[PDB]
């Protein structure tokens, strides 16, 4: 999975006619049995998932939250598939992840409790990834909007995003940035995904295939950035330790950032 | 307490002549025995509490910090009243809350230690709410201003606000947003309360009855938002699952934000 | 160490010809054996440490990270010196600090794990201070830049900065702000230092002697803040408890901010 591109794509499990397209456009597809599908449509979604299989090495299935009758039906259904990685919505403790063993688990922390227990969830053995959800977050806080007038996330959402990035990285898990619900707001998605790439998120999860090209381009460093990385790496080959390059103190971790941009560009 | 409006108002306990005015203007009155009252005036303040009752169902009393002789004298003064809900300043541990049993406690976290321990404080059995305080926070950090030139809270205060909001919601406690000290700054207050309302705070604490109307208004969504909520919900009942509405991916938690808007207007 | 001014300065240990200049420019000097010095220059740095001593009372030595052969050689080298305070890079647990007993440790938290464990690190018995580092942080997250286009730290870094400030203050440890790598960027350094001084950081670490006067300046409150502090403290000497002053509500912690402004001026 860590070898798949950054362009991951949700597609509702009761929409099998879209599966192959989802697979085609995206790096990894998340087949959704949760919020994407109404309760009356779950069983059909579960039949589709087993009737219309995708490459299980590039497909994750978002099941329902722990302690729900739906999750048990999902697990019963997945029994009849070859999918080994699931996403857990409303992830709220290590126990919720651990009981999914031996499947690989991407924990979607999208509640206060989850936020408070982030590191615990990250540390759990089955965890291979962490994602965060702004909208469920606010909803469970009893709020009404995740962003301010100007489109930026409200503080608590920004806070949780950092918390999840830290928890995931501190335990060597993948970090996935939140979805961008404004389908046509290409510009905002781009800015969001450039920043996500810059701080070390591994994935930006998309909800529409038109988003994928934007995310992929956004995870390629700017031309001026690659130029810089090339320059500082070259200059460092004539240096021992800390030096000044173009007005700034360079040393090990900065050289590490440069290497990372060049790796991302090659990827 | 969950049943009162968002407009809470401090009034120092040594000004019994303002108690009825406060009760009249506010949803809940916080009678203050701590910072609002000089040490030399505390004993008279305590006398005021016993001599000028307010409806104990709409009235909270902020006592002094744990381990202080003042707190001991507050509790014995309080033995002569019907007040069963107290606010604990400088709340720094679960033990400080638990020791106040059997009273209900709103923890005011306004120290670094408090912030480090917020989740533990919120989980404590008597806790029914959490509030944060930016000014003691900065004071205890060794700092000198909680806000930038432009009026925004400095990063650490913004950080603690979110910490407390999450700690409270994670254990189902009321969340109270900090006081706005600039009494004539109606605009700043409104901007604060509007965002507090959006992110799930239940209350904005006020320090002047002129602020209640502002907080009450801010907690009722704008016309534009209510129109949208009506719209999204209406469409939602012809919808089954995730759909697109006005360019936005909509599902479950977005629907929940809309309900919450309408609930807040209804309230 | 809490008695020296806020202008701390890094100097790599491989460059002993600058030791006295740095000791002259700065309040405290951090002699560096880690990232400022290339692996092949380490042994000479160590030689230089023992052979070119500075006032141990105004010098801290940044050694290498826990569990490395380098750190072992560092301590071995320090045995022949009078330096009793060390800076610990990549601080990731209480155990890494505790093993440095009986030396005093400034923990430099600059990884996600460190951040997740900040309070644990802060509480450890040898810790006397905390510092954070944005660039190793970003590097370990798998990111490529600590700052946005406008120079502002990205969120996760801002988030980590507050974590450290809060962790260190919760256990009474010194707090040290991150270095400013853009040597020429006086204005940004000024703006960071000013804000660091406002939220209670004790120190801004510098990486070039030309930065120290900016930092010292930044930590001295502006003439306008000082006149305010004077004004408010004077008015307060005629008041009892909370009072309105120049449109703001004033009580204890506001009065404390004023005292701290005037203390920083006198210092
Ligand atoms: C929101 C949504 C229902 C919009 O559907 P829509 O109205 O058909 O959107 P469009 O009209 O723009 O679709 C255009 C094309 O993109 C395809 N498409 C859109 N979203 C897709 C998706 N999530 N997966 C696969 N294909 C998708 C459509 O099939 C269509 O393809 P086609 O024209 O070649 O036949 C759909 O985008 C979707 O399901 N998004 C994700 C929902 C989800 O999983 N939420 C759960 C977690 S947030
Ligand atoms: C700041 C403060 C001392 C100013 O008092 P002030 O100088 O009288 O200010 P104003 O002149 O504008 O007050 C006007 C009116 O509002 C009333 N008022 C102001 N603050 C009030 C309060 N907190 N509670 C009840 N009434 C209040 C006054 O009674 C006065 O009423 P009146 O005109 O009918 O006589 C006062 O607002 C106050 O005590 N606020 C709360 C402080 C506190 O509790 N701090 C501790 C925690 S933050
Ligand atoms: C980056 C660095 C090598 C720049 O070196 P430089 O190119 O010689 O810098 P300048 O040209 O601006 O030098 C200006 C003067 O200040 C001195 N100076 C610069 N940085 C200094 C430092 N960190 N300590 C002591 N003196 C320093 C120089 O020696 C020079 O003095 P001089 O004229 O008497 O010879 C130097 O700033 C440095 O080593 N900074 C700290 C690096 C470090 O320790 N990083 C680890 C943690 S971030
Ligand atoms: Mg969700
Ligand atoms: Mg206070
Ligand atoms: Mg570093």
PDB file of N, CA, C and O and ligand atoms in Angstrom, chain A residues 251-253, chain C residues 34-35 62 89-90 108 110 132-137, ligand 6:
ATOM      1  N   UNK A 251      21.540  22.064   7.089  1.00  0.00           N
ATOM      2  CA  UNK A 251      22.177  20.869   7.613  1.00  0.00           C
ATOM      3  C   UNK A 251      21.287  19.663   7.387  1.00  0.00           C
ATOM      4  O   UNK A 251      20.280  19.753   6.687  1.00  0.00           O
ATOM      5  N   UNK A 252      21.675  18.549   7.996  1.00  0.00           N
ATOM      6  CA  UNK A 252      21.063  17.235   7.783  1.00  0.00           C
ATOM      7  C   UNK A 252      19.564  17.164   7.441  1.00  0.00           C
ATOM      8  O   UNK A 252      19.199  16.592   6.408  1.00  0.00           O
ATOM      9  N   UNK A 253      18.682  17.698   8.316  1.00  0.00           N
ATOM     10  CA  UNK A 253      17.236  17.551   8.065  1.00  0.00           C
ATOM     11  C   UNK A 253      16.714  18.335   6.856  1.00  0.00           C
ATOM     12  O   UNK A 253      15.811  17.854   6.158  1.00  0.00           O
TER      13      UNK A 253
ATOM     14  N   UNK C  34      26.160  17.169  17.295  1.00  0.00           N
ATOM     15  CA  UNK C  34      25.236  16.469  16.404  1.00  0.00           C
ATOM     16  C   UNK C  34      25.180  17.049  14.966  1.00  0.00           C
ATOM     17  O   UNK C  34      26.202  17.162  14.300  1.00  0.00           O
ATOM     18  N   UNK C  35      23.992  17.416  14.491  1.00  0.00           N
ATOM     19  CA  UNK C  35      23.803  17.745  13.065  1.00  0.00           C
ATOM     20  C   UNK C  35      24.639  18.900  12.457  1.00  0.00           C
ATOM     21  O   UNK C  35      24.874  18.916  11.248  1.00  0.00           O
ATOM     22  N   UNK C  62      25.138  20.150  23.020  1.00  0.00           N
ATOM     23  CA  UNK C  62      24.209  19.238  22.367  1.00  0.00           C
ATOM     24  C   UNK C  62      24.962  17.984  21.930  1.00  0.00           C
ATOM     25  O   UNK C  62      25.842  18.034  21.078  1.00  0.00           O
ATOM     26  N   UNK C  89      19.169  15.509  21.438  1.00  0.00           N
ATOM     27  CA  UNK C  89      18.401  15.556  20.191  1.00  0.00           C
ATOM     28  C   UNK C  89      17.411  14.393  20.077  1.00  0.00           C
ATOM     29  O   UNK C  89      17.572  13.379  20.762  1.00  0.00           O
ATOM     30  N   UNK C  90      16.400  14.544  19.229  1.00  0.00           N
ATOM     31  CA  UNK C  90      15.469  13.449  18.934  1.00  0.00           C
ATOM     32  C   UNK C  90      14.955  12.814  20.224  1.00  0.00           C
ATOM     33  O   UNK C  90      14.782  11.598  20.312  1.00  0.00           O
ATOM     34  N   UNK C 108      15.332  18.132  23.352  1.00  0.00           N
ATOM     35  CA  UNK C 108      14.929  18.716  22.073  1.00  0.00           C
ATOM     36  C   UNK C 108      14.001  17.728  21.373  1.00  0.00           C
ATOM     37  O   UNK C 108      14.456  16.720  20.812  1.00  0.00           O
ATOM     38  N   UNK C 110      11.772  16.798  18.449  1.00  0.00           N
ATOM     39  CA  UNK C 110      11.807  17.154  17.043  1.00  0.00           C
ATOM     40  C   UNK C 110      11.452  15.957  16.185  1.00  0.00           C
ATOM     41  O   UNK C 110      11.902  15.841  15.054  1.00  0.00           O
ATOM     42  N   UNK C 132      11.940  22.592  20.857  1.00  0.00           N
ATOM     43  CA  UNK C 132      11.369  21.851  19.743  1.00  0.00           C
ATOM     44  C   UNK C 132      12.123  22.222  18.478  1.00  0.00           C
ATOM     45  O   UNK C 132      12.772  23.251  18.433  1.00  0.00           O
ATOM     46  N   UNK C 133      12.052  21.365  17.462  1.00  0.00           N
ATOM     47  CA  UNK C 133      12.733  21.603  16.203  1.00  0.00           C
ATOM     48  C   UNK C 133      11.834  21.262  15.032  1.00  0.00           C
ATOM     49  O   UNK C 133      11.376  20.126  14.911  1.00  0.00           O
ATOM     50  N   UNK C 134      11.576  22.238  14.160  1.00  0.00           N
ATOM     51  CA  UNK C 134      10.594  22.030  13.094  1.00  0.00           C
ATOM     52  C   UNK C 134      11.098  21.129  11.957  1.00  0.00           C
ATOM     53  O   UNK C 134      10.323  20.373  11.363  1.00  0.00           O
ATOM     54  N   UNK C 135      12.399  21.204  11.675  1.00  0.00           N
ATOM     55  CA  UNK C 135      12.960  20.585  10.478  1.00  0.00           C
ATOM     56  C   UNK C 135      13.209  19.076  10.620  1.00  0.00           C
ATOM     57  O   UNK C 135      12.866  18.310   9.717  1.00  0.00           O
ATOM     58  N   UNK C 136      13.771  18.625  11.740  1.00  0.00           N
ATOM     59  CA  UNK C 136      13.768  17.177  11.977  1.00  0.00           C
ATOM     60  C   UNK C 136      12.332  16.650  12.059  1.00  0.00           C
ATOM     61  O   UNK C 136      12.008  15.626  11.462  1.00  0.00           O
ATOM     62  N   UNK C 137      11.462  17.388  12.746  1.00  0.00           N
ATOM     63  CA  UNK C 137      10.055  17.016  12.821  1.00  0.00           C
ATOM     64  C   UNK C 137       9.505  16.724  11.435  1.00  0.00           C
ATOM     65  O   UNK C 137       9.000  15.640  11.178  1.00  0.00           O
TER      66      UNK C 137
HETATM   67 MG1  LIG D   6      17.301  18.618  14.626  1.00  0.00          MG
END
